Amino acid sequence: EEEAVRLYIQWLKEGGPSSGRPPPS
């Protein structure tokens, strides 16, 4: 498991594409 994927899942769960930001990777 990554952190950057952790972040991903972060980004994602915090909104992902609809969080006003592009994903970690």
PDB file of all heavy atoms in Angstrom:
ATOM      1  N   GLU A   1       0.847  -1.212   0.000  1.00  0.00           N
ATOM      2  CA  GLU A   1       0.000   0.000   0.000  1.00  0.00           C
ATOM      3  C   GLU A   1       0.873   1.249   0.000  1.00  0.00           C
ATOM      4  O   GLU A   1       1.886   1.306   0.693  1.00  0.00           O
ATOM      5  CB  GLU A   1      -0.908   0.007   1.234  1.00  0.00           C
ATOM      6  CG  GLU A   1      -1.814   1.227   1.320  1.00  0.00           C
ATOM      7  CD  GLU A   1      -2.593   1.289   2.616  1.00  0.00           C
ATOM      8  OE1 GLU A   1      -2.074   1.857   3.603  1.00  0.00           O
ATOM      9  OE2 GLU A   1      -3.726   0.773   2.661  1.00  0.00           O
ATOM     10  N   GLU A   2       0.489   2.239  -0.789  1.00  0.00           N
ATOM     11  CA  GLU A   2       1.197   3.508  -0.809  1.00  0.00           C
ATOM     12  C   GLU A   2       0.619   4.477   0.192  1.00  0.00           C
ATOM     13  O   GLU A   2      -0.373   4.199   0.860  1.00  0.00           O
ATOM     14  CB  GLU A   2       1.096   4.206  -2.156  1.00  0.00           C
ATOM     15  CG  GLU A   2       1.796   3.505  -3.309  1.00  0.00           C
ATOM     16  CD  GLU A   2       0.918   2.478  -3.986  1.00  0.00           C
ATOM     17  OE1 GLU A   2       0.932   1.306  -3.564  1.00  0.00           O
ATOM     18  OE2 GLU A   2       0.210   2.840  -4.947  1.00  0.00           O
ATOM     19  N   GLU A   3       1.247   5.629   0.252  1.00  0.00           N
ATOM     20  CA  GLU A   3       0.687   6.777   0.870  1.00  0.00           C
ATOM     21  C   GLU A   3      -0.005   7.612  -0.173  1.00  0.00           C
ATOM     22  O   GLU A   3      -1.043   8.208   0.060  1.00  0.00           O
ATOM     23  CB  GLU A   3       1.776   7.601   1.462  1.00  0.00           C
ATOM     24  CG  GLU A   3       1.210   8.683   2.314  1.00  0.00           C
ATOM     25  CD  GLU A   3       2.266   9.550   2.965  1.00  0.00           C
ATOM     26  OE1 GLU A   3       2.783  10.471   2.296  1.00  0.00           O
ATOM     27  OE2 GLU A   3       2.584   9.318   4.152  1.00  0.00           O
ATOM     28  N   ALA A   4       0.616   7.663  -1.322  1.00  0.00           N
ATOM     29  CA  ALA A   4       0.076   8.378  -2.454  1.00  0.00           C
ATOM     30  C   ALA A   4      -1.239   7.757  -2.903  1.00  0.00           C
ATOM     31  O   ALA A   4      -2.122   8.440  -3.409  1.00  0.00           O
ATOM     32  CB  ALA A   4       1.098   8.366  -3.559  1.00  0.00           C
ATOM     33  N   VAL A   5      -1.372   6.456  -2.692  1.00  0.00           N
ATOM     34  CA  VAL A   5      -2.639   5.792  -2.943  1.00  0.00           C
ATOM     35  C   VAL A   5      -3.554   6.026  -1.774  1.00  0.00           C
ATOM     36  O   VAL A   5      -4.763   6.076  -1.915  1.00  0.00           O
ATOM     37  CB  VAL A   5      -2.505   4.279  -3.190  1.00  0.00           C
ATOM     38  CG1 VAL A   5      -2.293   3.517  -1.891  1.00  0.00           C
ATOM     39  CG2 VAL A   5      -3.733   3.756  -3.927  1.00  0.00           C
ATOM     40  N   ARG A   6      -2.955   6.223  -0.626  1.00  0.00           N
ATOM     41  CA  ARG A   6      -3.703   6.518   0.575  1.00  0.00           C
ATOM     42  C   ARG A   6      -4.368   7.861   0.384  1.00  0.00           C
ATOM     43  O   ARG A   6      -5.517   8.080   0.746  1.00  0.00           O
ATOM     44  CB  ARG A   6      -2.728   6.549   1.739  1.00  0.00           C
ATOM     45  CG  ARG A   6      -2.769   5.319   2.603  1.00  0.00           C
ATOM     46  CD  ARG A   6      -2.072   5.540   3.935  1.00  0.00           C
ATOM     47  NE  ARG A   6      -2.046   4.323   4.743  1.00  0.00           N
ATOM     48  CZ  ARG A   6      -1.732   4.293   6.036  1.00  0.00           C
ATOM     49  NH1 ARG A   6      -1.418   5.413   6.679  1.00  0.00           N
ATOM     50  NH2 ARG A   6      -1.738   3.138   6.689  1.00  0.00           N
ATOM     51  N   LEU A   7      -3.603   8.719  -0.249  1.00  0.00           N
ATOM     52  CA  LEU A   7      -3.983  10.016  -0.671  1.00  0.00           C
ATOM     53  C   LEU A   7      -5.007  10.013  -1.723  1.00  0.00           C
ATOM     54  O   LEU A   7      -5.773  10.943  -1.900  1.00  0.00           O
ATOM     55  CB  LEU A   7      -2.781  10.592  -1.260  1.00  0.00           C
ATOM     56  CG  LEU A   7      -1.994  11.312  -0.271  1.00  0.00           C
ATOM     57  CD1 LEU A   7      -0.800  11.793  -0.947  1.00  0.00           C
ATOM     58  CD2 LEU A   7      -2.828  12.432   0.224  1.00  0.00           C
ATOM     59  N   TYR A   8      -4.902   9.017  -2.491  1.00  0.00           N
ATOM     60  CA  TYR A   8      -5.804   8.811  -3.565  1.00  0.00           C
ATOM     61  C   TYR A   8      -7.143   8.561  -3.053  1.00  0.00           C
ATOM     62  O   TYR A   8      -8.101   9.228  -3.399  1.00  0.00           O
ATOM     63  CB  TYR A   8      -5.354   7.631  -4.357  1.00  0.00           C
ATOM     64  CG  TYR A   8      -6.202   7.367  -5.511  1.00  0.00           C
ATOM     65  CD1 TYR A   8      -6.634   8.395  -6.287  1.00  0.00           C
ATOM     66  CD2 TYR A   8      -6.501   6.085  -5.857  1.00  0.00           C
ATOM     67  CE1 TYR A   8      -7.357   8.167  -7.399  1.00  0.00           C
ATOM     68  CE2 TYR A   8      -7.211   5.823  -6.985  1.00  0.00           C
ATOM     69  CZ  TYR A   8      -7.643   6.871  -7.774  1.00  0.00           C
ATOM     70  OH  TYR A   8      -8.357   6.626  -8.925  1.00  0.00           O
ATOM     71  N   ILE A   9      -7.171   7.611  -2.206  1.00  0.00           N
ATOM     72  CA  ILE A   9      -8.339   7.213  -1.558  1.00  0.00           C
ATOM     73  C   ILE A   9      -8.833   8.356  -0.687  1.00  0.00           C
ATOM     74  O   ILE A   9      -9.995   8.451  -0.321  1.00  0.00           O
ATOM     75  CB  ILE A   9      -7.945   6.015  -0.753  1.00  0.00           C
ATOM     76  CG1 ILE A   9      -7.399   4.999  -1.729  1.00  0.00           C
ATOM     77  CG2 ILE A   9      -9.084   5.500   0.062  1.00  0.00           C
ATOM     78  CD1 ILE A   9      -6.697   3.872  -1.068  1.00  0.00           C
ATOM     79  N   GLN A  10      -7.902   9.247  -0.431  1.00  0.00           N
ATOM     80  CA  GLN A  10      -8.144  10.463   0.311  1.00  0.00           C
ATOM     81  C   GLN A  10      -8.877  11.422  -0.553  1.00  0.00           C
ATOM     82  O   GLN A  10     -10.036  11.719  -0.333  1.00  0.00           O
ATOM     83  CB  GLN A  10      -6.836  11.098   0.701  1.00  0.00           C
ATOM     84  CG  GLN A  10      -6.335  10.609   1.998  1.00  0.00           C
ATOM     85  CD  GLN A  10      -7.202  11.083   3.140  1.00  0.00           C
ATOM     86  OE1 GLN A  10      -7.314  10.427   4.177  1.00  0.00           O
ATOM     87  NE2 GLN A  10      -7.835  12.233   2.943  1.00  0.00           N
ATOM     88  N   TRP A  11      -8.151  11.868  -1.558  1.00  0.00           N
ATOM     89  CA  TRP A  11      -8.654  12.691  -2.606  1.00  0.00           C
ATOM     90  C   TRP A  11     -10.021  12.203  -2.981  1.00  0.00           C
ATOM     91  O   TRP A  11     -10.997  12.915  -2.816  1.00  0.00           O
ATOM     92  CB  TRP A  11      -7.683  12.554  -3.766  1.00  0.00           C
ATOM     93  CG  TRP A  11      -8.158  13.127  -5.034  1.00  0.00           C
ATOM     94  CD1 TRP A  11      -8.227  14.428  -5.384  1.00  0.00           C
ATOM     95  CD2 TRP A  11      -8.614  12.383  -6.125  1.00  0.00           C
ATOM     96  NE1 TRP A  11      -8.754  14.540  -6.654  1.00  0.00           N
ATOM     97  CE2 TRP A  11      -8.987  13.278  -7.130  1.00  0.00           C
ATOM     98  CE3 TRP A  11      -8.747  11.031  -6.332  1.00  0.00           C
ATOM     99  CZ2 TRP A  11      -9.495  12.839  -8.345  1.00  0.00           C
ATOM    100  CZ3 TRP A  11      -9.250  10.598  -7.533  1.00  0.00           C
ATOM    101  CH2 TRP A  11      -9.618  11.504  -8.523  1.00  0.00           C
ATOM    102  N   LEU A  12     -10.063  10.946  -3.389  1.00  0.00           N
ATOM    103  CA  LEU A  12     -11.278  10.262  -3.779  1.00  0.00           C
ATOM    104  C   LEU A  12     -12.419  10.407  -2.774  1.00  0.00           C
ATOM    105  O   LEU A  12     -13.508  10.861  -3.122  1.00  0.00           O
ATOM    106  CB  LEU A  12     -10.919   8.816  -3.912  1.00  0.00           C
ATOM    107  CG  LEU A  12     -10.355   8.401  -5.260  1.00  0.00           C
ATOM    108  CD1 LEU A  12      -9.906   6.976  -5.220  1.00  0.00           C
ATOM    109  CD2 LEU A  12     -11.377   8.608  -6.356  1.00  0.00           C
ATOM    110  N   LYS A  13     -12.182  10.002  -1.537  1.00  0.00           N
ATOM    111  CA  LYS A  13     -13.225  10.019  -0.524  1.00  0.00           C
ATOM    112  C   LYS A  13     -13.541  11.439  -0.078  1.00  0.00           C
ATOM    113  O   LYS A  13     -14.665  11.741   0.324  1.00  0.00           O
ATOM    114  CB  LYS A  13     -12.812   9.147   0.651  1.00  0.00           C
ATOM    115  CG  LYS A  13     -12.760   7.674   0.291  1.00  0.00           C
ATOM    116  CD  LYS A  13     -12.299   6.832   1.471  1.00  0.00           C
ATOM    117  CE  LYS A  13     -12.833   5.410   1.396  1.00  0.00           C
ATOM    118  NZ  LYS A  13     -12.471   4.739   0.121  1.00  0.00           N
ATOM    119  N   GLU A  14     -12.549  12.311  -0.164  1.00  0.00           N
ATOM    120  CA  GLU A  14     -12.745  13.724   0.088  1.00  0.00           C
ATOM    121  C   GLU A  14     -13.433  14.378  -1.118  1.00  0.00           C
ATOM    122  O   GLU A  14     -13.788  15.558  -1.082  1.00  0.00           O
ATOM    123  CB  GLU A  14     -11.403  14.411   0.395  1.00  0.00           C
ATOM    124  CG  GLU A  14     -10.663  13.824   1.574  1.00  0.00           C
ATOM    125  CD  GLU A  14      -9.423  14.620   1.940  1.00  0.00           C
ATOM    126  OE1 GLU A  14      -8.390  14.473   1.251  1.00  0.00           O
ATOM    127  OE2 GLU A  14      -9.471  15.391   2.919  1.00  0.00           O
ATOM    128  N   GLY A  15     -13.616  13.598  -2.189  1.00  0.00           N
ATOM    129  CA  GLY A  15     -14.361  14.071  -3.346  1.00  0.00           C
ATOM    130  C   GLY A  15     -13.840  13.549  -4.683  1.00  0.00           C
ATOM    131  O   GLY A  15     -14.570  13.561  -5.676  1.00  0.00           O
ATOM    132  N   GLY A  16     -12.600  13.060  -4.706  1.00  0.00           N
ATOM    133  CA  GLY A  16     -11.935  12.715  -5.948  1.00  0.00           C
ATOM    134  C   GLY A  16     -12.065  13.789  -7.007  1.00  0.00           C
ATOM    135  O   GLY A  16     -11.815  14.964  -6.733  1.00  0.00           O
ATOM    136  N   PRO A  17     -12.422  13.401  -8.242  1.00  0.00           N
ATOM    137  CA  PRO A  17     -12.549  14.326  -9.363  1.00  0.00           C
ATOM    138  C   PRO A  17     -13.411  15.541  -9.010  1.00  0.00           C
ATOM    139  O   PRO A  17     -13.208  16.642  -9.520  1.00  0.00           O
ATOM    140  CB  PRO A  17     -13.237  13.495 -10.444  1.00  0.00           C
ATOM    141  CG  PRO A  17     -12.874  12.087 -10.134  1.00  0.00           C
ATOM    142  CD  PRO A  17     -12.691  12.015  -8.644  1.00  0.00           C
ATOM    143  N   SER A  18     -14.370  15.324  -8.113  1.00  0.00           N
ATOM    144  CA  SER A  18     -15.297  16.364  -7.697  1.00  0.00           C
ATOM    145  C   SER A  18     -14.863  16.993  -6.368  1.00  0.00           C
ATOM    146  O   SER A  18     -15.693  17.437  -5.575  1.00  0.00           O
ATOM    147  CB  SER A  18     -16.702  15.774  -7.572  1.00  0.00           C
ATOM    148  OG  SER A  18     -17.074  15.095  -8.764  1.00  0.00           O
ATOM    149  N   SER A  19     -13.558  17.020  -6.127  1.00  0.00           N
ATOM    150  CA  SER A  19     -13.011  17.668  -4.944  1.00  0.00           C
ATOM    151  C   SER A  19     -12.272  18.928  -5.375  1.00  0.00           C
ATOM    152  O   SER A  19     -11.516  19.527  -4.610  1.00  0.00           O
ATOM    153  CB  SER A  19     -12.081  16.714  -4.179  1.00  0.00           C
ATOM    154  OG  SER A  19     -11.844  17.152  -2.850  1.00  0.00           O
ATOM    155  N   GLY A  20     -12.505  19.313  -6.628  1.00  0.00           N
ATOM    156  CA  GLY A  20     -11.876  20.492  -7.189  1.00  0.00           C
ATOM    157  C   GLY A  20     -10.404  20.289  -7.472  1.00  0.00           C
ATOM    158  O   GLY A  20      -9.685  21.237  -7.787  1.00  0.00           O
ATOM    159  N   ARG A  21      -9.953  19.049  -7.363  1.00  0.00           N
ATOM    160  CA  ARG A  21      -8.554  18.732  -7.557  1.00  0.00           C
ATOM    161  C   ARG A  21      -8.380  17.443  -8.325  1.00  0.00           C
ATOM    162  O   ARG A  21      -9.255  16.577  -8.303  1.00  0.00           O
ATOM    163  CB  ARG A  21      -7.868  18.630  -6.206  1.00  0.00           C
ATOM    164  CG  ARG A  21      -8.575  17.700  -5.259  1.00  0.00           C
ATOM    165  CD  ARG A  21      -7.857  17.624  -3.926  1.00  0.00           C
ATOM    166  NE  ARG A  21      -8.663  16.955  -2.913  1.00  0.00           N
ATOM    167  CZ  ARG A  21      -8.153  16.293  -1.882  1.00  0.00           C
ATOM    168  NH1 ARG A  21      -6.839  16.203  -1.721  1.00  0.00           N
ATOM    169  NH2 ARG A  21      -8.963  15.725  -1.007  1.00  0.00           N
ATOM    170  N   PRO A  22      -7.263  17.317  -9.052  1.00  0.00           N
ATOM    171  CA  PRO A  22      -6.885  16.086  -9.711  1.00  0.00           C
ATOM    172  C   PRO A  22      -6.220  15.137  -8.729  1.00  0.00           C
ATOM    173  O   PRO A  22      -5.641  15.569  -7.731  1.00  0.00           O
ATOM    174  CB  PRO A  22      -5.892  16.545 -10.795  1.00  0.00           C
ATOM    175  CG  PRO A  22      -5.878  18.034 -10.727  1.00  0.00           C
ATOM    176  CD  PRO A  22      -6.275  18.360  -9.327  1.00  0.00           C
ATOM    177  N   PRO A  23      -6.301  13.833  -8.994  1.00  0.00           N
ATOM    178  CA  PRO A  23      -5.875  12.818  -8.038  1.00  0.00           C
ATOM    179  C   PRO A  23      -4.367  12.726  -7.861  1.00  0.00           C
ATOM    180  O   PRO A  23      -3.599  13.081  -8.756  1.00  0.00           O
ATOM    181  CB  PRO A  23      -6.446  11.533  -8.622  1.00  0.00           C
ATOM    182  CG  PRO A  23      -6.490  11.778 -10.088  1.00  0.00           C
ATOM    183  CD  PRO A  23      -6.817  13.236 -10.243  1.00  0.00           C
ATOM    184  N   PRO A  24      -3.964  12.263  -6.670  1.00  0.00           N
ATOM    185  CA  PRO A  24      -2.573  12.124  -6.231  1.00  0.00           C
ATOM    186  C   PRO A  24      -1.576  11.799  -7.335  1.00  0.00           C
ATOM    187  O   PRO A  24      -0.559  12.482  -7.489  1.00  0.00           O
ATOM    188  CB  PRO A  24      -2.658  10.955  -5.246  1.00  0.00           C
ATOM    189  CG  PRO A  24      -4.038  10.956  -4.734  1.00  0.00           C
ATOM    190  CD  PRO A  24      -4.883  11.824  -5.619  1.00  0.00           C
ATOM    191  N   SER A  25      -1.864  10.756  -8.083  1.00  0.00           N
ATOM    192  CA  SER A  25      -0.961  10.286  -9.117  1.00  0.00           C
ATOM    193  C   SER A  25      -1.063  11.172 -10.360  1.00  0.00           C
ATOM    194  O   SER A  25      -0.184  12.042 -10.549  1.00  0.00           O
ATOM    195  CB  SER A  25      -1.264   8.823  -9.457  1.00  0.00           C
ATOM    196  OG  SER A  25      -0.242   8.247 -10.258  1.00  0.00           O
TER     197      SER A  25
END
